[PDB]
Design a protein around this ligand. Structure first.
Ligand SMILES: *[C@@H]1O[C@H](CO)[C@@H](O[C@H]2O[C@H](CO)[C@@H](O[C@@H]3O[C@H](CO[C@H]4O[C@H](CO[C@H]5O[C@H](CO)[C@@H](O)[C@H](O)[C@@H]5O)[C@@H](O)[C@H](O)[C@@H]4O)[C@@H](O)[C@H](O)[C@@H]3O)[C@H](O)[C@H]2NC(C)=O)[C@H](O)[C@H]1NC(C)=O
Ligand SMILES: *[C@@H]1O[C@H](CO)[C@@H](O[C@H]2O[C@H](CO)[C@@H](O[C@@H]3O[C@H](CO[C@@H]4O[C@H](CO)[C@@H](O)[C@H](O)[C@@H]4O)[C@@H](O)[C@H](O)[C@@H]3O)[C@H](O)[C@H]2NC(C)=O)[C@H](O)[C@H]1NC(C)=O
Ligand code: HEM
Ligand code: HEM
Ligand SMILES: *[C@@H]1O[C@H](CO)[C@@H](O[C@@H]2O[C@H](CO)[C@@H](O)[C@H](O)[C@H]2NC(C)=O)[C@H](O)[C@H]1NC(C)=O
Ligand SMILES: *[C@@H]1O[C@H](CO)[C@@H](O[C@H]2O[C@H](CO)[C@@H](O)[C@H](O)[C@H]2NC(C)=O)[C@H](O)[C@H]1NC(C)=O
Ligand SMILES: *[C@@H]1O[C@H](CO)[C@@H](O[C@H]2O[C@H](CO)[C@@H](O)[C@H](O)[C@H]2NC(C)=O)[C@H](O)[C@H]1NC(C)=O
Ligand SMILES: *[C@H]1O[C@H](CO)[C@@H](O[C@@H]2O[C@H](CO)[C@@H](O)[C@H](O)[C@H]2NC(C)=O)[C@H](O)[C@H]1NC(C)=O
Ligand SMILES: CCCCCCCCO[C@@H]1O[C@H](CO)[C@@H](O)[C@H](O)[C@H]1O
Ligand SMILES: CCCCCCCCO[C@@H]1O[C@H](CO)[C@@H](O)[C@H](O)[C@H]1O
Ligand SMILES: CCCCCCCCO[C@@H]1O[C@H](CO)[C@@H](O)[C@H](O)[C@H]1O
Ligand SMILES: CCCCCCCCO[C@@H]1O[C@H](CO)[C@@H](O)[C@H](O)[C@H]1O
Ligand SMILES: CCCCCCCCO[C@@H]1O[C@H](CO)[C@@H](O)[C@H](O)[C@H]1O
Lengths: 553, 553
């Protein structure tokens, strides 16, 4: 007998529970719907659904008018809308968390065991006819071919939003504090136990590592002086596990929070910035607190850095990414009147979603010099001899790639795209159309409606068979891209929920934490509130170069 | 220079931060108060404080006039009040949590490291003149002598509320799932990482141990059958670490979630009840879902037993303890309106508070037979000799001892009381009156006001010197009891916040979790809703004896 939940019979966040031998029922409490499958709307929701404009109309409003939005930003409407954005986006995520790789149901282990990644949609059951549920062919398309035919870059398609490499390396550095898929436990498991903006990519995911990175004097982290400039210390000085090529001198090796940051100079660049920030913050804290011990100077400085990160992400990072004329604002006080759970669990969906690999260009330009992938990768010297200020200027000037649209990931890093598609099948993720339903969108009727283009659509028809068989990661990477945007609509409608939930779901945003005491007084509290990417770099360097998430134009 | 925060200058929930050499500044954010010390009230606070009745007046209303409460319990006023009972009690607790034994401030480590017990008040700083801060003598009164002169039982004083040993054992059994002080790590640390009603005393504090208890067929835990009755398995079948005295046979040894439970027949009794219940629930779940594997059958059965506990504890356990004429009601939907955090962390002060050793009698009576402490303690044969039925009847008829008042903890277990006081000083807990202010009460002006008694109050002043120097634990047990009640006001006013926060703060009480599907449909969802102490026993036994938290009368 065929498993009923393979058809995904229930709508609007309803739960498919199997009863008896071949039967099923659906629990649709607080979904706003009624019925056996739950399609009958309630008084309130029927009014809510007919007076709702499409996600296209909202995107059109936020990205048009210059004009209307200049007024909104200069008034209280700015805060009224920001509260609404935070409210409506975050509700689309289970909190407390629901499912994981092992359990397609709510359990105590799924709540307690933080080594698991979270899961919004249940897995595609192993007793389903097709691998994507009910619709499609017996064997899924080849992971290698799809990447080679639809993802592989041929011509460099730049980002129309003016995104630079400086963003890319930030989008990698920042993202790697909550995405740490373990090689030991395998897919669906994480090492980054902080599950968000904890800075376990600066201080480390465990305490043993943290104590090694610390100088134990003035609350500062260890450092080495190269060319009269502050850099992360050598492994010979602070012995921690770092993924470096075998044979590299211990002096050249640099010790940081995240063990992967050594492989790219861009990652080690940001690791240098935050380090240089942490220590100078300790200097400002010791100025008004001479009685404070080493522990307090350290722990308070961390929270300031956590607060600065979220400020810079919300107000500057996401701002560039969204392309809104609405001036996004980091103010936790906005959620003080509403019901919000101050916790977050990192989902595998978000992991799969955040594989923005098409940012990485064909080469890496540093001023008059041009560097290849074989030259740029694993380079240990490049960080030091160029310096921070000269290297930041280089990444802030070079244009980054277009994420959406397709055919825009370099061949050197193409081996990651296939792993994502292969790992998705191991996770048994539901088809793209089912993930659109969950995030308040309409499922695509055809492959034509997905891409808008004709040629690439016909080839996807023949491979997948049905549109309801299309996979999660290819769907996002091949969705039609509205002329002057970085990616398709689904990326925003799915990404923003996870993003905003994790950024505001931080405990420092809660009423009990969001106060001057937590940050050692007014001085620390203002540092959190007035932080910008420009002040993160230039206040730490010697000369202030060009620094933004957009190219100079 | 003397540390300014030793005087406790910051009134109400105001945070004392130290600035410069000999200065301090006080952070009165969201406390309702203004000024350098948090003493100038806002419009609303000034209104609220004048219209607010004293806690002793409200207790009088809740424990008098049966006629008025008969009208309230049969109407929605029962819900309106119960919601208010939940909201205003839980609001007195920081969530996300604040301090621990290592940090007198807010830090990420304090939020992240689950091994720590929490603090509501920060510790008495190490650089204060007296050990209690500013007032009292240079050396605190002898811990061993305090316990012998004021706490030691002489004549048996039973509880006037008619509390039986059946309650007392439940109290101990239930409470030891979140109280697990690590001997390896020391005081201020816990092994119960679940922090609340997770049933880590039934399934274990870790996953490696959990699996050892599980049968892995039909979601049931392992069990052995003696005399025809179901009992927890032997260590020979389920090899888990337990604190049995060296020399005991592996057959008479019985394996459960909590390692200490093998020491007392009362603790091992309840362990058998919840064992039979879990396996009983698995039978009913298998009936509805034949397709379910072992894991889903187990995980759901755990959640149902989690719900059953939170029902019994509120509607019967706390009902008996409080003696309120208002019928307490467990409905998570009451908190669906206001702002609530579904997150809990056990405080070290909650640990000190729950040490209700006066509950235990001079001897243990089982029908026409009487068992001394030497006989009752550590017996393995005892619970199997009489069975569950006879033992349940026995403890339900014997009266427990009054916790408050004084002189009611038996000499056999008196050594614990000494350790609690000794540990308090290691944890450096703030004086009793400072804990009173924090829980919305007035500090005691003298020792006479605390006791309502002449002789023992006079010696207390001779031992301590100042009332503001009285310690947390002795202050709770040596407080004037209201006539007919089980303990003094302070234990209600401090305990109930911790108790109701840990019960309703459980993720199963959240909108995401509190669904029919979570408990495998209607059958499991009603089991949670119709859970009583009587049902927990009668359904799992052949014959049902007297079952209640109070003596028959
Ligand atoms: C978060 O979640 C993850 C995954 O759930 C978890 O990771 C670990 O999970 C398990 C359990 O700890 C680890 O171990 C694996 O499980 C098997 C068990 O299978 C067999 O076990 C029995 C054999 O052991 C014992 O046998 C005799 C008696 O039978 C006994 O006397 C001996 O002492 C002996 O130990 C056997 O009876 C049974 O029939 C099974 O065949 C282990 O054998 C082995 O170790 C497995 O690897 C995993 O390694 C962990 N990783 C993963 C990826 O699963 C985390 O622990 C959890 N985190 C937290 C904080 O809880
Ligand atoms: C919960 O959080 C607890 C915070 O106290 C953790 O405490 C435990 O781990 C600590 C470190 O792993 C222990 O602290 C000590 O640190 C000193 C300092 O030396 C430092 O360690 C290096 C290796 O030993 C040295 O090379 C280097 O010099 C460095 O400065 C060390 O001498 C001690 O040996 C010890 O490591 C601490 O003792 C320990 N227990 C307690 C009770 O504090 C827990 O790790 C954490 N628990 C869990 C379950 O996550
Ligand atoms: C040229 C630089 C890049 C290289 C060499 C690279 C390569 C890799 C490799 C080999 C892995 C798997 C290793 C592992 O973590 O187990 C990985 C993971 C990942 N990458 Fe990249 N990639 C690059 C660019 C980027 C960028 C710019 C982003 C930012 C969006 C990104 C996002 C991610 C994410 C989110 C993961 C998963 C992390 C985890 O769960 O462990 N990658 N990358
Ligand atoms: C005769 C039966 C009892 C015995 C033999 C007993 C014995 C003990 C002992 C030896 C300790 C360790 C204290 C220490 O660190 O020195 C302890 C802890 C404790 N007891 Fe009891 N006790 C009994 C009854 C009770 C009762 C009725 C309660 C009420 C709930 C209770 C509550 C507690 C609590 C809350 C702890 C602290 C747990 C921890 O943090 O480790 N006990 N008990
Ligand atoms: C690592 O980066 C450094 C840049 O500091 C590279 O050194 C440069 O190499 C180019 C040729 O590719 C020379 O023209 C420059 O004069 C070099 N600059 C300096 C300051 O030495 C180095 O080649 C890179 N490493 C690898 C392995 O490619
Ligand atoms: C509930 O879900 C099922 C499955 O998706 C829907 O379709 C089923 O029921 C119909 C009854 O008339 C049959 O015609 C279909 O063949 C049958 N299909 C499957 C795959 O089971 C059904 O329409 C939904 N019910 C409602 C009221 O919308
Ligand atoms: C706030 O509280 C402080 C400490 O409890 C009060 O005490 C201060 O003033 C006293 C004289 O009235 C001095 O003798 C104390 O030493 C001094 N404390 C310190 C740390 O300097 C103080 O009165 C209160 N503040 C105000 C403005 O009244
Ligand atoms: C533990 O208690 C049990 C009760 O079951 C004791 O066993 C009984 O002891 C009583 C004495 O009051 C006698 O009537 C019986 O002979 C015993 N019954 C059996 C079946 O042996 C036991 O002695 C106690 N253990 C200790 C160490 O004192
Ligand atoms: C009418 C005033 C415009 C305010 C814009 C609010 C932005 C909220 O964004 C909304 O998020 C929801 C959940 O992700 C989606 O269902 C909506 O399509 C989307 O517009
Ligand atoms: O002008 C526009 O301004 C908008 C922000 O106001 C963004 O969409 C872009 O920077 C730009 O196209
Ligand atoms: C007529 C009875 C009114 C019942 C409503 C009061 C129940 C709310 O509980 C209240 O919590 C407060 C804060 O912890 C305490 O100060 C009060 O003593 C307590 O009554
Ligand atoms: C509004 C109800 C009117 C009844 C008058 C009520 C008398 C309340 O008087 C109460 O007596 C108690 C004695 O146990 C004290 O604990 C309280 O402090 C006191 O307020
Ligand atoms: C220091 C703790 C103060 C908490 C007091 C909270 C009092 C609740 O305030 C009440 O809330 C109601 C909604 O439930 C509103 O209808 C009332 O207008 C409002 O007075």
């Amino acid at each position: 007998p065929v498993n009923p939940c393979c058809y995904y019979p229930c709508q609007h966040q309803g739960i498919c529970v199997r009863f008896g031998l071949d039967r099923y029922q659906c629990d649709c409490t607080r979904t706003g719907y009624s019925g056996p499958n739950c399609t009958i709307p309630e008084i309130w929701t029927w009014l809510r659904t007919t007076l709702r404009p499409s996600p296209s109309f909202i995107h059109f409003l936020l990205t048009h008018g210059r004009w209307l939005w200049d007024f909104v930003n200069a008034t209280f409407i700015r805060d009224t809308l920001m509260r609404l954005v935070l409210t409506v986006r975050s509700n689309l995520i289970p909190s407390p968390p629901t499912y994981n790789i092992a359990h397609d149901y709510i359990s105590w282990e799924s709540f307690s065991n933080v080594s698991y990644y979270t899961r919004i949609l249940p897995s595609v059951p192993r007793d389903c006819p097709t691998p994507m549920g009910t619709k499609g062919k017996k064997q899924l398309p080849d992971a290698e071919f799809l990447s080679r035919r639809f993802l592989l870059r041929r011509k460099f398609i730049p980002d129309p939003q003016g995104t630079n490499l400086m963003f890319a390396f930030f989008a990698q550095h920042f993202t790697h504090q909550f995405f740490k898929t373990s090689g030991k436990m395998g897919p669906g498991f994480t090492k980054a136990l902080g599950h968000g903006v904890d800075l376990g990519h600066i201080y480390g995911d465990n305490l043993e590592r943290q104590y090694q990175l610390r100088l134990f004097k003035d609350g500062k982290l260890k450092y080495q002086m190269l060319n009269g400039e502050v850099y992360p210390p050598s492994v010979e000085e602070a012995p921690v596990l770092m993924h470096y090529p075998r044979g590299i001198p211990p002096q050249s090796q640099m010790a940081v929070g995240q063990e992967v940051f050594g492989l790219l100079p861009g990652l080690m660049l940001y690791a240098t910035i935050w380090l240089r920030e942490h220590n100078r913050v300790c200097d400002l804290l010791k100025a008004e607190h001479p009685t404070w011990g080493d522990e307090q100077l350290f722990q308070t400085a961390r929270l300031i850095l956590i607060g600065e990160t979220i400020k810079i992400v919300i107000e500057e990072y996401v701002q560039q990414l969204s392309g809104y004329f609405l001036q996004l604002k980091f103010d936790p006080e906005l959620l003080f009147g509403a019901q919000f759970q101050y916790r977050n669990r990192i989902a595998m969906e978000f992991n799969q979603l955040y594989h923005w690999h098409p940012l990485m260009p064909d080469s890496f330009r540093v001023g008059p010099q041009d560097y290849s992938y074989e030259q740029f990768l694993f380079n240990t010297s490049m960080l030091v001899d160029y310096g921070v200020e000269a290297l930041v200027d280089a990444f802030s000037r070079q244009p980054a790639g277009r994420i959406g649209g397709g055919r825009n990931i370099d061949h050197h890093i193409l081996h990651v795209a296939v792993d994502v598609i292969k790992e998705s099948r191991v996770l048994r993720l539901q088809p793209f159309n089912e993930y659109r339903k969950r995030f308040g969108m309409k499922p695509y009727t055809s492959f034509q409606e997905l891409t808008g283009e004709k040629e690439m659509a016909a080839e996807l028809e023949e491979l997948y068979g049905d549109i309801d068989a299309l996979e999660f990661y290819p769907g996002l990477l091949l969705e039609k891209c509205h002329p002057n945007s970085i990616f398709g609509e689904s990326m925003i409608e799915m990404g923003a929920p996870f993003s905003l939930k994790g950024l505001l779901g931080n405990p420092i945003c809660s009423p009990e934490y969001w106060k001057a005491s937590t940050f050692g007084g007014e001085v620390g509290f203002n540092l959190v509130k007035t932080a910008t990417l420009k002040k993160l770099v230039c206040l730490n360097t010697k000369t202030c170069p060009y620094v933004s998430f957009h190219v100079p134009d």
